[PDB]
Design an enzyme around this catalytic site. Structure first.
Site, PDB file in Angstrom:
ATOM      1  N   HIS A  61       0.797  -1.234   0.000  1.00 22.05           N
ATOM      2  CA  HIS A  61       0.000   0.000   0.000  1.00 22.05           C
ATOM      3  C   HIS A  61       0.827   1.280   0.000  1.00 22.05           C
ATOM      4  O   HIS A  61       0.279   2.345  -0.315  1.00 22.05           O
ATOM      5  CB  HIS A  61      -1.065   0.047   1.118  1.00 22.05           C
ATOM      6  CG  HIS A  61      -0.565  -0.226   2.493  1.00 22.05           C
ATOM      7  ND1 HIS A  61      -0.525  -1.491   3.035  1.00 22.05           N
ATOM      8  CD2 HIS A  61      -0.177   0.618   3.484  1.00 22.05           C
ATOM      9  CE1 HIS A  61      -0.069  -1.423   4.274  1.00 22.05           C
ATOM     10  NE2 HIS A  61       0.148  -0.156   4.570  1.00 22.05           N
ATOM     11  N   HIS A  91       6.537   7.055   5.642  1.00 22.12           N
ATOM     12  CA  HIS A  91       6.013   6.647   4.345  1.00 22.12           C
ATOM     13  C   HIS A  91       5.312   7.857   3.728  1.00 22.12           C
ATOM     14  O   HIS A  91       5.175   8.905   4.363  1.00 22.12           O
ATOM     15  CB  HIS A  91       5.022   5.462   4.485  1.00 22.12           C
ATOM     16  CG  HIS A  91       3.857   5.841   5.308  1.00 22.12           C
ATOM     17  ND1 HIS A  91       3.839   5.753   6.678  1.00 22.12           N
ATOM     18  CD2 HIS A  91       2.677   6.417   4.957  1.00 22.12           C
ATOM     19  CE1 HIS A  91       2.682   6.250   7.120  1.00 22.12           C
ATOM     20  NE2 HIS A  91       1.958   6.663   6.097  1.00 22.12           N
ATOM     21  N   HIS A  93       1.995   9.143   0.836  1.00 18.77           N
ATOM     22  CA  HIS A  93       0.821   8.931   0.020  1.00 18.77           C
ATOM     23  C   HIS A  93       0.926   9.869  -1.176  1.00 18.77           C
ATOM     24  O   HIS A  93       1.391  11.000  -1.021  1.00 18.77           O
ATOM     25  CB  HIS A  93      -0.467   9.241   0.811  1.00 18.77           C
ATOM     26  CG  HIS A  93      -0.556   8.500   2.112  1.00 18.77           C
ATOM     27  ND1 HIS A  93      -1.284   7.348   2.282  1.00 18.77           N
ATOM     28  CD2 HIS A  93       0.030   8.733   3.307  1.00 18.77           C
ATOM     29  CE1 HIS A  93      -1.149   6.913   3.536  1.00 18.77           C
ATOM     30  NE2 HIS A  93      -0.349   7.737   4.186  1.00 18.77           N
ATOM     31  N   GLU A 103      -3.423  13.472   1.675  1.00 18.47           N
ATOM     32  CA  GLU A 103      -4.542  13.004   2.490  1.00 18.47           C
ATOM     33  C   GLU A 103      -5.208  14.198   3.159  1.00 18.47           C
ATOM     34  O   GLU A 103      -6.385  14.482   2.922  1.00 18.47           O
ATOM     35  CB  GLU A 103      -4.022  11.970   3.487  1.00 18.47           C
ATOM     36  CG  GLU A 103      -3.459  10.728   2.769  1.00 18.47           C
ATOM     37  CD  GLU A 103      -3.581   9.484   3.586  1.00 18.47           C
ATOM     38  OE1 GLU A 103      -3.040   9.454   4.713  1.00 18.47           O
ATOM     39  OE2 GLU A 103      -4.240   8.528   3.099  1.00 18.47           O
ATOM     40  N   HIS A 116       4.393  11.107   5.980  1.00 17.63           N
ATOM     41  CA  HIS A 116       3.998  10.792   7.346  1.00 17.63           C
ATOM     42  C   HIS A 116       5.178  10.189   8.088  1.00 17.63           C
ATOM     43  O   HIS A 116       5.616   9.074   7.759  1.00 17.63           O
ATOM     44  CB  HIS A 116       2.831   9.811   7.352  1.00 17.63           C
ATOM     45  CG  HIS A 116       1.578  10.423   6.859  1.00 17.63           C
ATOM     46  ND1 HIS A 116       0.490   9.678   6.427  1.00 17.63           N
ATOM     47  CD2 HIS A 116       1.248  11.729   6.736  1.00 17.63           C
ATOM     48  CE1 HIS A 116      -0.450  10.535   6.057  1.00 17.63           C
ATOM     49  NE2 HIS A 116      -0.028  11.778   6.259  1.00 17.63           N
ATOM     50  N   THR A 195      -4.751   6.615   8.896  1.00 13.92           N
ATOM     51  CA  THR A 195      -5.484   6.836   7.647  1.00 13.92           C
ATOM     52  C   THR A 195      -5.608   5.575   6.805  1.00 13.92           C
ATOM     53  O   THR A 195      -6.217   5.619   5.734  1.00 13.92           O
ATOM     54  CB  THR A 195      -4.882   7.949   6.813  1.00 13.92           C
ATOM     55  OG1 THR A 195      -3.613   7.483   6.339  1.00 13.92           O
ATOM     56  CG2 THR A 195      -4.742   9.252   7.588  1.00 13.92           C
TER      57      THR A 195
HETATM   58  N1  LIG Z   1      -1.026   6.767   7.329  1.00 11.26           N
HETATM   59  S1  LIG Z   1      -0.776   6.969   8.912  1.00 11.26           S
HETATM   60  O1  LIG Z   1       0.414   7.760   9.118  1.00 11.26           O
HETATM   61  O2  LIG Z   1      -1.985   7.423   9.528  1.00 11.26           O
HETATM   62  C1  LIG Z   1      -0.412   5.386   9.592  1.00 11.26           C
HETATM   63  C2  LIG Z   1       0.661   5.242  10.473  1.00 11.26           C
HETATM   64  C3  LIG Z   1       0.947   4.016  11.029  1.00 11.26           C
HETATM   65  C4  LIG Z   1       0.162   2.918  10.728  1.00 11.26           C
HETATM   66  O3  LIG Z   1       0.473   1.712  11.285  1.00 11.26           O
HETATM   67  C5  LIG Z   1      -0.916   3.057   9.852  1.00 11.26           C
HETATM   68  C6  LIG Z   1      -1.203   4.288   9.294  1.00 11.26           C
HETATM   69 HG   LIG Z   2      -0.992  -3.412   2.227  1.00 10.12          HG
HETATM   70 ZN   LIG Z   3       0.228   7.695   6.139  1.00  7.05          ZN
END
Ligand SMILES: NS(=O)(=O)c1ccc(O)cc1
Ligand SMILES: [Hg+2]
Ligand SMILES: [Zn+2]
Ligand SMILES: OC[C@H]1O[C@@H](O)[C@H](O)[C@@H](O)[C@@H]1O
Ligand SMILES: OC[C@H]1O[C@H](O)[C@H](O)[C@@H](O)[C@@H]1O
Ligand SMILES: NS(=O)(=O)c1ccc(O)cc1
Ligand SMILES: NS(=O)(=O)c1ccc(O)cc1
EC number: 4.2.1.1
Length: 257
Positions: A61, A91, A93, A103, A116, A195
């Site tokens: 993802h 990571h 998006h 996002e 993020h 998210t």
């Molecule tokens: N996209 S997020 O940063 O909100 C996030 C961070 C850690 C995780 O395990 C899942 C999503």
């Molecule tokens: Hg995944």
């Molecule tokens: Zn994220």
């Protein structure tokens, strides 16, 4: 499995993760006129000088750059946070086109991508226990716009051809995440969620106001990644963002007057 297609994307997630319709979901639109300066916020401290990056992983993802979080090295303190939050991974998006991909949005404007940096509250001992707590996580979010190249992103870009497909990883030691930050630490903050599934409502979001600039060539390399595994039909890893969710009974606070 959940994903970002028509048949398994954000509009479907609630069927297996009912918190998707919860009271503190992320991301949100940041209405800059309604956000209020909060004089009670303490100075924000991003302390990444001793960060120890380890590995970069295509998890199907996004791609995660993982850090040693076995002791306080790269940490985030101050601002809205009580205590010390330890960096575990970052990571991004991003979109299929430069006009979408973030996002969070800012007065409804979508950026090309969003970084993020994910941290967990050390009072809870590790990440898994932290995601059972309403103040378990802090995510530092940084918008990306397309313009000049970001030198501190180039090492990331260049390794992506070695982790094209889901389940691939590569060594990624000695990477300095300080090279991904804008000049200013002005920010907005609000309580929210992961998210991606499981969408857990454990996050203090800290979203920087100043975007970083990355080049078109850099983001084009993000878009060559694959959601699929090796040997499976190629599905480009693009548009891996969740749209803005209802603000409900929340206020966004600003660190700056
Ligand atoms: N996209 S997020 O940063 O909100 C996030 C961070 C850690 C995780 O395990 C899942 C999503
Ligand atoms: Hg995944
Ligand atoms: Zn994220
Ligand atoms: O009652 C007044 C208070 O209302 C709250 O919703 C705001 O967050 C505060 O900044 C304000 O002082
Ligand atoms: O810093 C992250 C990575 O950047 C470059 O790919 C270097 O060649 C590699 O040694 C390092 O692990
Ligand atoms: N609720 S979900 O997005 O995880 C999902 C959607 C469709 C599907 O076939 C399997 C899972
Ligand atoms: N030697 S360096 O840090 O300038 C460097 C290494 C790898 C890379 O993809 C980009 C820059």
């Amino acid at each position: 499995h959940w994903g970002y297609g028509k048949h398994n994307g954000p509009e479907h997630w609630h069927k297996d993760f009912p918190i998707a319709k919860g009271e503190r979901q992320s991301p949100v639109d940041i209405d800059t006129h309604t956000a209020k300066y909060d004089p009670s916020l303490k100075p924000l401290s991003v302390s990444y000088d001793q960060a120890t990056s380890l590995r970069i992983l295509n998890n199907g993802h996004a791609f995660n750059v993982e850090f040693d979080d076995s002791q306080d090295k790269a940490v985030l303190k101050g601002g809205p946070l009580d205590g010390t939050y330890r960096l575990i991974q970052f990571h991004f998006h991003w979109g299929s086109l430069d006009g979408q991909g973030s996002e969070h949005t800012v007065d409804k404007k979508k950026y090309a991508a969003e970084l993020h940096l994910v941290h967990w509250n050390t009072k809870y001992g590790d990440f898994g226990k932290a995601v059972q707590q309403p103040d378990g996580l802090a995510v530092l979010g940084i918008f990306l716009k397309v313009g000049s190249a970001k030198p501190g992103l180039q090492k990331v870009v260049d390794v992506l051809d070695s982790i094209k497909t889901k389940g691939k990883s590569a060594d990624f030691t000695n990477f300095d995440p300080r090279g991904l930050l804008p000049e200013s630490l002005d920010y907005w903050t609000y309580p929210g969620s992961l998210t991606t599934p499981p969408l857990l409502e454990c996050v203090t979001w800290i979203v920087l106001k100043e975007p970083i600039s990355v080049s078109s060539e850099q983001v084009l390399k993000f878009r060559k990644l694959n959601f699929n595994g090796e040997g499976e039909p190629e599905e480009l890893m693009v548009d891996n963002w969740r749209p803005a969710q209802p603000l409900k009974n929340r206020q966004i606070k600003a660190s700056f007057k």
